[PDB]
């Protein structure tokens, strides 16, 4: 339960002003990761610091619109 | 550069024309839209 | 009279009518665009051909039938047709940018990858490469016809120039059917859009040069060329490597790397 | 016959007559937009009541000072007057094609027009940016419109520097190399071929432009997985060569008038004055991103873009020093011509080096999209680019029409425009400093004061360019015909007579080897 | 075919006055008129088109 | 061929100078005069 | 904010913003000396009845001309090169926020902890309470702590904008389907203001921004009062 | 940098017509063989409604406006999926 | 979820002769997978497919020489 969680660091994949793929990938981190956790033995507060990452970093619209292809099975990248 | 004298010299009287007319010619219509500019606003 | 060899042109009406044929063509894609009508388009493309063939017609007058064309007037065509190839390089690097600044980078609304999710290309092994032979193969019986006309041989250039223009219409008409047969569409985000501006433009190039080579050959089948003058000749081949050329950069960048 | 003189006309100096004729016009509706964009914001508030119009006027403006009256003048105009007599040609390379390049201007300026009738109109910035230009928030024809405009202006220009460059390589006497030619058709050569690599360029960018609002395609567009910021690199790679285009054939009169009123047989250094226009032509096709500075770029772009941009000051105080050397030791005779060139020759640099604070793109930040940059351009560009056409329309005019202008007149003509164009853009770098954007309708109460100043300046430019008008009608008007010129042994274009015949160089120059 | 250049030489060489794009004979007067009158033509219908489309259409 | 020398290598006429001066006035009054009327149609349009 | 006839930069409220003053005076001087130079030099050249019109040799005195400058050049470039680095440099930021752009006003989003988000517009001029500032009030400011290192990501809903805020020399372009970081941090508390700065459509001069800054501990209770 | 060809001594119209017929023809040839194996049609994949394509942002100048300007109802299904 | 695991499926990532980068690919996702799950709320049954993968397609000395490797501190690929 390693927290202490402000927001996001600095990562070195990402270290230019355009930040786009630090939240897509993210999002996509956590979303791999959270499916995963759901083999048998799997929980998902694994997954949870991708989470704090793409809530911190992602526009609420981005978020919102990748959730709804997610579910209309119109999401581009793979998960 | 050398000239012949003028074939046909504009006197100041003309000169005066020639300005005036030029110059109304460039703000009377300009002057009439913007002097009217309220009347287009409100339409 | 004169005693330089430079070309004095009578005054002309065609390039006011070239002018007018372009406002004629921009303002009719405007008014099929934006007003459901066809009108003005259809005037302006037909006042466009009539405006280009009674130029290059008087152009040919000019020169086969009058003897303006003194070496020093053909040096300087031949560096204008260089000059406006240049610029026609440039207007394809403009897309080739568009294809490379999308496709290094694909955005996450393609999937983050290219090709998109979602994008099947067409396979760069089958029509693509056959149209890569054939342009490539035009190259070389171009090249043929050339060397025919110099070395005074009338049978084997048209030949060769015929078979030229066999193959840019085998390459127009495979594009064409690749265009139907292809699953995406140039509404099919940006790879769409990519392929089919430059491609699409590319082959454009190849309909405006083979109609040059097929003035060319009509000019040979009248005997207008001789051995050694035959500029409009060696404009259109060039013209030709340009188009082909274009086509080795388009297979390469869009068709192989990008698949 | 005169339709087959002036709509037919296969002949350099009534084609460039047209030109001028063109440009002229057309500077009178690009001055009545600044005008109206000066009225807008001459006190706090609104004036038009409707902002999507003065965005209108402003994209405008631009468009029409730049490609309707500067280019036309500057390449068209005293180009094609002055290049094939400088080298002794009996015309342009392509004089019929030349003809078309002056005909697709007035429909190019036509599909303007009708851009701001239509709809309501394209309020994009003349940089026509996407979304903002886009079929979602400037539906309609306008955006339209204005893309064709530009498509024409283009090909008009594009086949004109194919027609320069053949020009000036193929039909000079043959005893004279490019190192024999004078400055200003050097300048023109360059400029030349500016044009043909960068308007390529801008044709695209404008051509995804349009598909993108048309044929659903979507170059520009995110949702389909492209980006605004392509339009943008595409537009700066043909915009930033077509500032150096606007101010290069300047370059060449400002020589050749120093040269001139100094009483030189020659301007000073005249290699590096080559070398130096060669040389800013070539840096200015590797900067453009200077006008990205606040897109997102990476650091270390950024610091490229700075460095490379900064080293064009270079070569242009090559030309500035020269100029000066120029008028070193000089007759100088204070002529009108004579004034416009040193009112350039300061205003210009002082542009100039406002740009090379613009270079930096540290504070850059702080400057860009607000009246600095205004006040940058409208020095370096504006200024500059009519100063050197002011200069060169009062020295050549007795050659084109045969006719002295008066030069009291003239002078007072130049006071006056010296004075409104300063009390206009000083000004506006204290406006940009502190903060205020650009493309605003109206400002915070603090910017009143230099606002209102500004405004007044526009209006004193407003009674010079009468005053232009009404000089050149007294010009026609008293008919002094001219006699002759001094230094027509370094002055080819003059020893033809004024107005030269409509045939000149029939019998070419002799100019021996040795 | 036979090499006829020399009579079109001949003929586009003839002291008539005539401009190049005049000289064939008849038919260059008739396409010119066709041309023209379609460009003039044209231009006055795309003028009538800008008229209609400045104003908002109910 | 075409006239030549000075007030004969132009469009216009300047045979008489106050013809000239209202030839001159409408060319240059009216592309000044366009702008302000554009904005007028524009602001009317609605 | 801008006050009346200001002849320079609103007065820094960042470190950063005080860097670039020092730059641009070190600049200013450099401008304000070539162009009264060129000046005195025209000045110079006219003033004199002696001639010398014959061939001048420019080899010599072209290697002034360009050493010079390009000298002048390197000790501009050099310090503005630093600023641009230390700008970039890793600054551990301890708060995002985003904002998105919109025609005509912005939108932030809080959305480290809990998941916070409000719309800013201005405030009319008919509306403004007395001693308010014309075009630049909203009625939801950017609370954020002052004298901390704040990240703020940048975009846009529609067209492109662009978020400034000139006394802590900020300026990024909203970009739809972009998101541009930058970095904040105050010095002071207190009310900082700006203007959209990428032309944007009819609203574009009447979308501001306006930050709000407070101590750590009040942002914390700001904060605390949303949930 | 030459192929493995190898003909000259003052190049020619005949070597260029040997160029021509002996590799550039048989060449297209042999890619046309090629070509007219690997033709007949793929399995036409699911449709699946994807955001980034079929856009339309304005109807096309022509038809019903959604339908592109070389549509193959085979392959190319609309914004609503393959037609009937 | 099915186990009965027999051997590893065909995987459409790997579909030539060449075999090596699909060991390769399956121990680096067990042991990411693995280290992921030592931490935060989680065990290493989730990581299981992955290892039957992997131990069904590397030589033993691969996975021996890659386990000395990460012992040791010089294995070259990122877990
Ligand atoms: C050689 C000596 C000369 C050298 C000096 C050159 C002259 C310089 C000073 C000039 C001093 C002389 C002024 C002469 C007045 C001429 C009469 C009856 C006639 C009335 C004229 C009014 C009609 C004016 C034309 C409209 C054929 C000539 C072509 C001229 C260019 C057309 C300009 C506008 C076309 C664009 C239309 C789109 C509008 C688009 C609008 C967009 C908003
Ligand atoms: C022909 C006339 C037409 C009429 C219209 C105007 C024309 C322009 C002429 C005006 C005569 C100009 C003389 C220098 C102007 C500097 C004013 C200034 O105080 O600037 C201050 C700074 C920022 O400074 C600050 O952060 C602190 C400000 C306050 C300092 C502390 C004192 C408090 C009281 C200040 C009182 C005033 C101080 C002025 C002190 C005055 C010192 C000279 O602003 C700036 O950077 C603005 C600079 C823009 C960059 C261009 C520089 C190149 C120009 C050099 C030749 C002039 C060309 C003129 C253009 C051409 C002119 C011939
Ligand atoms: C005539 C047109 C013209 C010319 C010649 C120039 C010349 C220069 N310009 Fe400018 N510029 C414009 C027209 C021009 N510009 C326009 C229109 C825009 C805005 C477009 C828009 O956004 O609409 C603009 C915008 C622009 C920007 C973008 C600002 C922004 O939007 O944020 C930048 C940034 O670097 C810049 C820099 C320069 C530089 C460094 C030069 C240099 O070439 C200047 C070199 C000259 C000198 C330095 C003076 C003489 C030199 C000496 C006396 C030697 C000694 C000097 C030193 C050692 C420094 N310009
Ligand atoms: C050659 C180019 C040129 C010229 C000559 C001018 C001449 C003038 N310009 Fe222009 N201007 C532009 C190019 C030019 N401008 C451009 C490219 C922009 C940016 C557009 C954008 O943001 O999209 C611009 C923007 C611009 C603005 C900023 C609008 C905004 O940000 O909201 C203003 C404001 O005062 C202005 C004023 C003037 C004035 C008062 C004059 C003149 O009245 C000064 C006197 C000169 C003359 C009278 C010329 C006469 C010659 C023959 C008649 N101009
Ligand atoms: C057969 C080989 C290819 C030959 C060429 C085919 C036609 C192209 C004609 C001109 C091409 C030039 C413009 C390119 C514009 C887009 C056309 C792209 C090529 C093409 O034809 O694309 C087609 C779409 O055409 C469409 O939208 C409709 C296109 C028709 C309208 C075009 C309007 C735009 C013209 C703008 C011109 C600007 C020119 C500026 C020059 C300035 C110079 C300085 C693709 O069909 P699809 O059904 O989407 O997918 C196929 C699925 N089965
Ligand atoms: C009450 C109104 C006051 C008007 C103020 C106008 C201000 C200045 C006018 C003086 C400018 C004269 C400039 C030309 C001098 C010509 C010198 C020359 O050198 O001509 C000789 C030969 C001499 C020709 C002299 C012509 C003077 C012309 C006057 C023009 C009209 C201005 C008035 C406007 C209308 C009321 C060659
Ligand atoms: C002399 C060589 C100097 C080096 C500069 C050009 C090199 C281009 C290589 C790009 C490769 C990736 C580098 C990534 C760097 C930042 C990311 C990525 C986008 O990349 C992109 O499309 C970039 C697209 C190209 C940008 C510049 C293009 C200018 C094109 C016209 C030049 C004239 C060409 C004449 C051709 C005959 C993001
Ligand atoms: C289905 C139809 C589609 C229509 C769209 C456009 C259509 C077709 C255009 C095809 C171009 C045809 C050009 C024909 C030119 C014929 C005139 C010619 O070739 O003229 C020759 C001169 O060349 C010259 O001007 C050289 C002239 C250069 C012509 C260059 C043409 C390129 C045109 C590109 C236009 C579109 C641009 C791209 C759009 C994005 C004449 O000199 P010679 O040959 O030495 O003869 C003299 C000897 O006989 C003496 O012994
Ligand atoms: C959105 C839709 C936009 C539409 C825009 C449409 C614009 C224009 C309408 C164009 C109509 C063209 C009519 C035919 C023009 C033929 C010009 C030509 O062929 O010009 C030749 C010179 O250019 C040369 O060679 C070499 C150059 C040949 C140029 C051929 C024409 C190209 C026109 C389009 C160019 C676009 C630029 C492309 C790159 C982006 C000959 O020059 P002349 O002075 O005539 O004669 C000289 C005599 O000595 C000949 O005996
Ligand atoms: C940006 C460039 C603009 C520069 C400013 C122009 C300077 C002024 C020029 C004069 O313009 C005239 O002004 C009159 C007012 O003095 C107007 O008459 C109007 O006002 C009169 C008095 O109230 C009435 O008699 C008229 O009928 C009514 O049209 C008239 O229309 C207008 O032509
Ligand atoms: C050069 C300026 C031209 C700009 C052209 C702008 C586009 C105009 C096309 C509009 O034409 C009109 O459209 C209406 C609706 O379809 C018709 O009912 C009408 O009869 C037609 O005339
Ligand atoms: C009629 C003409 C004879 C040459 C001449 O007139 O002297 C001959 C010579 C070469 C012939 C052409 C070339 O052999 C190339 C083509 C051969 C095709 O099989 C028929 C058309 C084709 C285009 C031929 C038509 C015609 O028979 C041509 C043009
Ligand atoms: C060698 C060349 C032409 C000389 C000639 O043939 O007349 C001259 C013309 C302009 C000269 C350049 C300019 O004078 C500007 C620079 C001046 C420096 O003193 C040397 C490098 C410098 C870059 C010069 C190098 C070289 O001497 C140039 C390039
Ligand atoms: Cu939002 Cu300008
Ligand atoms: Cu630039
Ligand atoms: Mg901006
Ligand atoms: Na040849
Ligand atoms: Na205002």
Redesign the pocket.
Known sequence: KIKNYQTAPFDSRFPNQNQTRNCWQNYLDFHRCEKAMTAKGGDVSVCEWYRRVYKSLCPISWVSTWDDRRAEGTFPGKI | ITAKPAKTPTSPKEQAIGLSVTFLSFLLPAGWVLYHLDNYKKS | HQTHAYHMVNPSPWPLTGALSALLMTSGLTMWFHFNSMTLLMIGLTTNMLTMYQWWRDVIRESTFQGHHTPAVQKGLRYGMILFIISEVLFFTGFFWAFYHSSLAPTPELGGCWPPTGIHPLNPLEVPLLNTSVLLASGVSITWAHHSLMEGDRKHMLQALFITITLGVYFTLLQASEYYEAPFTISDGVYGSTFFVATGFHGLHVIIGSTFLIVCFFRQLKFHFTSNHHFGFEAAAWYWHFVDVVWLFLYVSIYWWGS | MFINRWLFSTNHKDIGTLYLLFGAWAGMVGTALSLLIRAELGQPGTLLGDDQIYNVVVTAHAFVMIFFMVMPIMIGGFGNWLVPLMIGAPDMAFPRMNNMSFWLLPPSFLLLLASSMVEAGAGTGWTVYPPLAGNLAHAGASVDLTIFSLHLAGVSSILGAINFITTIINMKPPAMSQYQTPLFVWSVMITAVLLLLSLPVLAAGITMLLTDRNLNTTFFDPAGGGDPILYQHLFWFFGHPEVYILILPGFGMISHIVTYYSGKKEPFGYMGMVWAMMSIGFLGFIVWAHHMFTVGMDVDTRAYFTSATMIIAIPTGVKVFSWLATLHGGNIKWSPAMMWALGFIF?FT?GG??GIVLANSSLDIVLHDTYYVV?HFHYVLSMGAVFAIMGGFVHWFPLFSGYTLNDTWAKIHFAIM??GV??TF??Q??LG?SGMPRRYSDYPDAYTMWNTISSM?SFISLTAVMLMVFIIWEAFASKREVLTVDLTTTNLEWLNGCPPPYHTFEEPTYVNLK | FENRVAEKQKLFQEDNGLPVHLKGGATDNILYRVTMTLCLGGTLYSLYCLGWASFPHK | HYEEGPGKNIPFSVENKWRLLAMMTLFFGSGFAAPFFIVRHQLLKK | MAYPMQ???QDATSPIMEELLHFHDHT?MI??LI??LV?YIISLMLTTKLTHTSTMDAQEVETIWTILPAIILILIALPSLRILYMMDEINNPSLTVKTMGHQWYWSYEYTDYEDLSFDSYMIPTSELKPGELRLLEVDNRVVLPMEMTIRMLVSSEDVLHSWAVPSLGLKTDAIPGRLNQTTLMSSRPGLYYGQCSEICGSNHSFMPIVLELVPLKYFEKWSASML | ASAAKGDHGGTGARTWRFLTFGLALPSVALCTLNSWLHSGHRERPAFIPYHHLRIRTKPFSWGDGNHTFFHNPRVNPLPTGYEK
């Open positions: 205003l002082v080096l406002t006040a010296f004075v300063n009390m000083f000004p770098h204290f400093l300046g | 002849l320079g930069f200013l401008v304000f162009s009264s000046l």
